[PDB]
Amino acid sequence: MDVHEHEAATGCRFSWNVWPATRAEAQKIELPLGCMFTPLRDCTSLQLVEYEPVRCRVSGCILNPFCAIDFRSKQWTCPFSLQRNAFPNHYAMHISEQNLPAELLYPTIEYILPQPMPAANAPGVSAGESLPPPLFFLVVDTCVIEEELDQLRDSLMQALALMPSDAMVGIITYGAMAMLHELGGGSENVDVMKAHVFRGNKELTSTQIQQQLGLARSANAYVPAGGPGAPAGSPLLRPAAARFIQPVGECEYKLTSILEELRRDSWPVPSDSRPMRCTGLALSVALAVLEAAWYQLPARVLLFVGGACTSGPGQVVDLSLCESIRHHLDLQKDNNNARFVKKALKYYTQLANQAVRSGHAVDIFACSLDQVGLYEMKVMTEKTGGCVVMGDSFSINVFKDSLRKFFETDSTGFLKMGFNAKIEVLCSKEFKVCGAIGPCTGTGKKGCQVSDTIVGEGMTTEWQAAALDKESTVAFYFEVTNQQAQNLPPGKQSFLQFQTSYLHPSGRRRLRVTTLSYRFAEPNTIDVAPGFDQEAAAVLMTRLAVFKTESEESLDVLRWLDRKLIRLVARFADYQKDDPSSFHLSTEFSIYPQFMYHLRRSHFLQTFNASPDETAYYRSVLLRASVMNALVMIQPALLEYSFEQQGPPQPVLLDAQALKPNVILLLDSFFHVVVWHGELIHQWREQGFHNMPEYENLRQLLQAPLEDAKVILDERFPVPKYVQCNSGGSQARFLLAKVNPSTNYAQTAGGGAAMAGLMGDSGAAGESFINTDDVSLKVFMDHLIKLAVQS
Amino acid sequence: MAWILKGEFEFLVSSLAERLDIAKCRGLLTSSLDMRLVCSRDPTFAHYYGAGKAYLGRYIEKHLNRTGLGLQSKYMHKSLGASIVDECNLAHIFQILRVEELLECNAQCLPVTVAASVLLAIVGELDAVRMDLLNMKKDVRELDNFRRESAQFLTDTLEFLVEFIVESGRDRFTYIKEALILSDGGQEYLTSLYALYRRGDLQLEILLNSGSILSIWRRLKALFELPRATAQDLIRWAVIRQAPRLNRLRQLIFTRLLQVLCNPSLRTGKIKGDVPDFPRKALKQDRAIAATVLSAFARSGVKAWCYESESQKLDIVRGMGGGEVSSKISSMLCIKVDRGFIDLPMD
Amino acid sequence: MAWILKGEFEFLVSSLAERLDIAKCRGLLTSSLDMRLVCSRDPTFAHYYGAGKAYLGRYIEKHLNRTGLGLQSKYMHKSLGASIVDECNLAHIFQILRVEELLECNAQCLPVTVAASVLLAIVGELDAVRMDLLNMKKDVRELDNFRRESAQFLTDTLEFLVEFIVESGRDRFTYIKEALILPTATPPRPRRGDLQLEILLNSGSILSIWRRLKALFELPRATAQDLIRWAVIRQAPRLNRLRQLIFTRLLQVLCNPSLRTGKIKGDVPDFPRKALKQDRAIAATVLSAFARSGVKAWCYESESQKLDIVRGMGGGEVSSKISSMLCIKVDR
Amino acid sequence: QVNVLEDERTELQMKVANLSERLTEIQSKIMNDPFLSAKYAAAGTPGAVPNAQTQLREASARLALAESVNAELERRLAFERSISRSWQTNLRAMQRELREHLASLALASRKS
Amino acid sequence: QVNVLEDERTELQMKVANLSERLTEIQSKIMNPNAQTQLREASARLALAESVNAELERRLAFERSISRSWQTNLRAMQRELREHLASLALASRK
Amino acid sequence: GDVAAQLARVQRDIDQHRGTGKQLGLTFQELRVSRMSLM
Amino acid sequence: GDVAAQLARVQRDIDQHRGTGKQLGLTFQELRVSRMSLM
């Protein structure tokens, strides 16, 4: 089998392809069943179609390729419930073994659902008109320095043209008080800007906010379609709500003129105090407007924040400058520096609660040296499917390219994102779903396909995800409920199914049905070994680790993954008892123990040398990346370029031995792309051998990584920090933080104390010594082998 | 005089391409068209490579008549025969006869030394599988006939491969003479010579030097039905040759090429009833056209370009992908248009 | 291996030029080479044009078998035939074989069509003279020793010329499959002067002016030099373009008598110094008369022969002034 | 010059109109019904080895692609003659009758 | 005025092009001698279509060069008329 | 930054030439219609 | 090299845009006088 081709064809990848047969074997695996699913994957064989998709109308199945063929009486067995299903009169009238329907031999089908009559919630939509375009509601911080705000202006003026001309847009600039700007109106008052002001330090409910703005639904608001002569009124928006939300091509001048007018917060900031900042109220009035005007319609709230919130709801740290912000050591052992993070974090949880019932997403573009409070405001972006872009400034390439690919188009010019998605999972009766981990939230849709065990967001077969894209991958956890192996016929194939009901940016309902087939193993426990996929299972255990660190201690999670590694290795390796020399692991388990070596030293579970905002940045993007991106962030990939090697890059392991003077290293850890040049490379180019023509060989070697680094910049969202450095430079610390030392203190002070004294020409080559306290790679292999064989 | 002479030439490449198609279907050519076993040094691959070297060793001296000035000197047909077996010409037949993208799990393209060693093993593997077919006896008559149609299918496959190989080496000798016949002197003679080695398409360059958006857009997409990793070698080397040497009326014509290529919105306009993916085989095609043209234009080497509008740069940056690319074309695009004056000069 | 390829087309192209030169030196091929008969369309030019066009096609299709793509596709062999009968093909042969130095009494540059017609007429006159030389009667023994050699000798040149046309039309055929077919269809790469003499200075071939130059020095020394120097002092600027390059190759032939003798593999003819004491004397007469000419606007073609002509003197007074007047290169 | 180029705007818009009307008619017809939609779901398959049938397909697709742009460039060609075949004649008579009036002016100037 | 309607109409000609090729892709989809002979008139008319639009493009480019003689020599009329009447004016001023 | 000022000058002058051009055509058309209305 | 020479010569083209700005102000006055006569 080809697991990489399976992702390219269906967008799904399983930890176990050969499934356990019984519940006793399912727990002796020591890895729970699970998979990664990308509901918007660009499949190589994806087929798009409009007709009414014939459901199973007693159970909820669909005609997958794995149905009954029944070419005599036109009724087929529903693959999950085993019930006969009569075809309609023209869906099987030309049936034979030469003509088939589309869904009976292709698994991944992209339906475009025929639009019904308008469902009495957007009055004024005619029968046959398209669904409304997506919305982008910019919420701009203004308490940053003036040079920072000019670069934020330049990126915003770029972004306003990157959105399609038909899409909706609104704008709010917030300092000490929130300003909801006026974009609409007639052509008679274009020259003067208006801004409704909300008091930044008080609590206003969503009900109250609509009442100040007149957006609240009137109890007697039926004058239904009875104006014969209203001139060219837009019927998707009510006239009260049209004053804030307008098409991009219609309010392009006014949205431009607001932006160069945008200066910093004019209120006096004391020199011993942070500036007054109502970030929490800014998202409140952003979400309340979108509630009244844009209910269950595609909305994205792009929050550009430039530091910590200090006032009103959702505010993280106080005003006086003597008190500092919170940290990992501050969170673990209860400091008074963070007395207001409680009703901060749970305020953002109820805004995300409002966001999922309304189907609006929240994206955050945070850019500050100081902490922006990303630990508490991560909760919207995980809950609705929004993205997080954390940069150090609004002008580094980490921000400009990430905002620009937020609006990048596909081959049809439409946005590469989906809104209001409805990911719905079905199973056969041998297995159920535990829960989901990632950018989705359960709805409480009960059924017979729910398992007792919960992994994350359970209690449903249907999850809300108001924002997905081509990279949004969702963890699904599965459990086998069979009690005895005698209940399965040999060679039995069980089936599972996904449906994704999302708004496309063209304004139409979609329904992507993807079906997979897998075979249960024999009662012997060894037969599942060829079906193991170590790469997807590492993403499975990392995602479940970072979910369990939310409630439990990260230290206790470290013991959990250690003892699960011991049980998995001892079960699936051939060895003699208490003989470490006879240890051997298969190809499917060869690199899996190295994955948890890098997992327990990664920043996902280690809180050392990090801010909680930076840790929240890594944890937010890990919960939405696919399998290849999760492997990159868990293991940095180092590639070597040298004259001795001809052709492709050579993957070198992350030790100090890979630091060679005559080579060039390319580091890829999903957050830093580092083009580091060797010591001899810097020695030759100091006088400039690459410039002068007699040594043009390292001119080609110097420009060689600039192509592959360009490749790993383009396909990557969010873009990583691009650092080009030499040997001994200040920018080489990014590579040195990930490079382990090849020599430890135990290997030096453990023996060999006199055969080293008197020979040879005053040193050799100047080795680089790196100080660390981590257990090295080879030592943990010896300890894991010793523990598994002994047990 | 020209259209017919094009016609049977692309027959000759297409018929051998569809014939290597049927050759793989039964499974006859497998041991040398798998790139993993090529770099693994399999012993049967060493047998099969030596079969090809022995076959071209015998074919250049048993089937080659002395033509023209070959008939004068003995050691001229020695240089003729040595130019058949020359490494670059076998690599060229390996490329243009459409072999690489139908290798057994091709991971990456192969450089010149190992590419021609694959083709020699392809000529060899054809020989000894036909020798294998002629070797088993007539046990079943109908199985012998199904074996005989495959045997004759592979017999004229090899004499079509070595006909193209001996054509490519007969190409080599009259060219090597024309290359050995002959700073502003030797250095720019050599670099201009290297430029005329890897030329762009003569039709696409004369279309760029004549000017019509529909005619040039025709030529970019029609050129990508040629095999990949070789068609874009025509595209990048065409545009780097003439983009520094275009007049300014055609200057804005080339940006009228760039916008429309990396814009799926002006193209495929808003139609009453349209979900416009359908064959994304053809909608990945225009992504390929925009990618190779614009990226090679970033390596064109000229520093100033003319654009008709602020929307012209703003449309190039739409689509494609973020990172590098637009930072070079939009930095280049600085001086703009006044196209109502280019047709009407004042002095 | 590359440089030994250089030496042998050096041996072959130089033997192309000298076998047409020596066949004229003995003299058997004069009707189709004279330009008056070309530009009047007399019967002898029409017969050699028809027979030359006839044989050249038959040599491609019947005397040359299928050698390549023509093994299966006969259309590729037909395009081989078209590429050798190509128009700019035979003018390219005309230039490299320097037949413009061998034509007689034409003062203007030939266009592509006329140069092809004169080349094709040379092939035709090779044909008919081979026809009757092998059809002479075997009667007299002294002539028998002559045309038992010169029949198969003229036969040897008969195929030789039309087969040098074969590669020179082949490199047209190859030039088609980067121009008309895609460029990646082919592999990539690694007072009262002598009045007879006067108008033949700017009209005719070096062979057709040498027989006057041998008898011009035969006069007593006072009058012999007199009719020469006063002729070229007023006629050297009149020699333009092609005729300007007839006088340049004139300096090469007379003053460098090394390749006048055919370098046959195993035979080189020899001459005494008493035979050269008038031919090199009149050669140095041309050198020193070109010295007082002072024609600053003089022109050359190739860089090989100026290094020969400065060295043909041995370091005399004229050596400084040859370099001061030939300084401009023009091809064709 | 301008007037024939609004005839460009009208005829180009009409040939967009009926071409989009064909590709909204056969496009809906083939694939709103399931069986003929599944004819595309089979397609000529998304696999290599064109099997000596679905490349007769492919050269025919490039054939109709070439004949369609051939029609567009020839309608371009004949309508570019309406641009060009007006700058020979009415300009020339302006040379002609400015010559007779200018030369008669010089003839009368050489009278007194 | 003529250039702003020239620019939109080359875009509208592109709107003709890709709606045409998407029409011919789907029309040749459904539709239904030897195969080796019915590739031949198919692709020799590809080379013949290549020859006709290469020559016609060379014709259209020549039609651009004659049409862009518009103000190159009408203003040369107005130059020569002005200086020949200015030599008369200079003589009258003298 | 002399070059940066020169490109910025012809950013706002080409756009200004378009504005003064397309509205000069408005006044030229206005002159002929004003002549026809007085006709 | 390419940027400097090609740019400095297009302000030679820019120099007459003050000419068409001037002529626009003159066609304003001709429109004013014809509107004077139409009333």
Side-chain angles (χ1 to χ4, degrees), chain A residues 601 603 667 732-740 770:
Chain A
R601 71 162 310 278
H603 287 95
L667 176 76
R733 57 182 182 177
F734 291 107
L735 178 75
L736 288 175
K738 305 294 181 183
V739 162
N740 300 321
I770 305 174

Side-chain angles (χ1 to χ4, degrees), chain A residues 44 48 162 404-405 411-412 714, chain B residues 264 277 281 318 321-323 326:
Chain A
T44 55
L48 184 136
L162 296 173
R404 168 209 176 174
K405 302 185 205 157
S411 60
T412 59
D714 299 336
Chain B
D277 313 316
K281 303 319 194 202
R318 294 181 61 51
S326 68

Side-chain angles (χ1 to χ4, degrees), chain B residues 20-78:
Chain B
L20 190 150
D21 281 322
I22 313 296
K24 181 266 290 181
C25 285
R26 298 285 75 78
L28 320 166
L29 278 286
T30 175
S31 165
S32 301
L33 69 90
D34 43 19
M35 61 79 71
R36 173 76 261 175
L37 282 72
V38 161
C39 58
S40 83
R41 181 36 48 205
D42 198 69
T44 75
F45 189 76
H47 181 75
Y48 268 122
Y49 178 77
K53 186 53 210 93
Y55 213 79
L56 290 179
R58 82 175 77 241
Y59 207 99
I60 67 170
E61 57 92 17
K62 287 285 192 143
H63 309 268
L64 261 172
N65 60 300
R66 256 179 181 100
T67 56
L69 202 64
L71 280 160
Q72 288 298 110
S73 182
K74 178 67 176 66
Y75 61 104
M76 293 298 103
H77 182 254
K78 207 197 158 169

Side-chain angles (χ1 to χ4, degrees), chain B residues 277-334:
Chain B
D277 313 316
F278 292 103
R280 214 178 305 102
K281 303 319 194 202
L283 282 72
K284 188 268 183 182
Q285 183 62 255
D286 64 344
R287 274 300 310 101
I289 301 293
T292 80
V293 167
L294 192 65
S295 295
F297 182 76
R299 277 89 70 188
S300 81
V302 65
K303 282 150 211 82
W305 217 252
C306 292
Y307 53 109
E308 298 208 6
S309 177
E310 284 321 284
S311 172
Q312 174 58 253
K313 301 186 279 326
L314 183 63
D315 189 359
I316 293 172
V317 298
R318 294 181 61 51
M320 65 182 180
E324 184 65 26
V325 59
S326 68
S327 66
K328 214 263 177 178
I329 296 89
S330 85
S331 77
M332 260 185 76
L333 281 170
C334 54

Side-chain angles (χ1 to χ4, degrees), chain A residues 421-601:
Chain A
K422 299 290 291 296
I423 181 65
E424 162 56 79
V425 60
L426 282 72
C427 308
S428 289
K429 65 93 174 179
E430 301 56 60
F431 61 100
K432 311 304 159 299
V433 296
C434 289
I437 286 300
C440 66
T441 309
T443 66
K445 181 178 178 177
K446 329 289 185 191
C448 65
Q449 303 171 331
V450 65
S451 180
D452 276 328
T453 315
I454 281 178
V455 183
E457 301 279 334
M459 290 315 78
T460 189
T461 55
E462 165 72 80
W463 281 249
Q464 293 324 80
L468 294 174
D469 62 356
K470 310 311 176 58
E471 292 185 346
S472 286
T473 313
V474 191
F476 284 162
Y477 284 76
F478 282 57
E479 203 267 356
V480 176
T481 57
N482 195 9
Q483 292 187 8
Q484 292 174 350
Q486 291 178 4
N487 295 340
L488 304 165
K492 190 175 179 65
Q493 299 182 319
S494 292
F495 314 108
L496 73 164
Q497 204 161 91
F498 312 125
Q499 291 82 17
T500 305
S501 302
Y502 64 95
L503 277 296
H504 182 254
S506 71
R508 193 57 65 59
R509 193 91 270 181
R510 305 209 162 198
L511 177 69
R512 188 202 279 227
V513 176
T514 307
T515 312
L516 313 173
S517 179
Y518 288 121
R519 45 139 277 171
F520 284 161
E522 295 183 1
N524 207 349
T525 191
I526 315 171
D527 293 336
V528 303
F532 185 51
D533 186 74
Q534 52 197 335
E535 309 293 324
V539 183
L540 202 44
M541 290 300 110
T542 294
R543 279 202 174 193
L544 189 42
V546 298
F547 174 71
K548 283 227 201 298
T549 49
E550 282 190 351
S551 60
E552 316 169 20
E553 292 191 354
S554 308
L555 285 190
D556 175 71
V557 171
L558 284 178
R559 187 184 279 176
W560 161 29
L561 60 93
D562 280 348
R563 80 178 92 89
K564 280 281 187 202
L565 170 61
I566 292 160
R567 297 283 82 79
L568 181 73
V569 162
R571 175 79 84 202
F572 287 99
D574 54 351
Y575 53 89
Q576 294 172 355
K577 191 173 179 179
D578 278 305
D579 191 21
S581 63
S582 61
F583 187 88
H584 180 54
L585 269 169
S586 66
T587 309
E588 290 89 12
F589 292 83
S590 57
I591 208 69
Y592 203 73
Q594 287 99 309
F595 283 149
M596 283 73 74
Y597 167 72
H598 280 106
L599 171 58
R600 74 176 61 91
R601 71 162 310 278

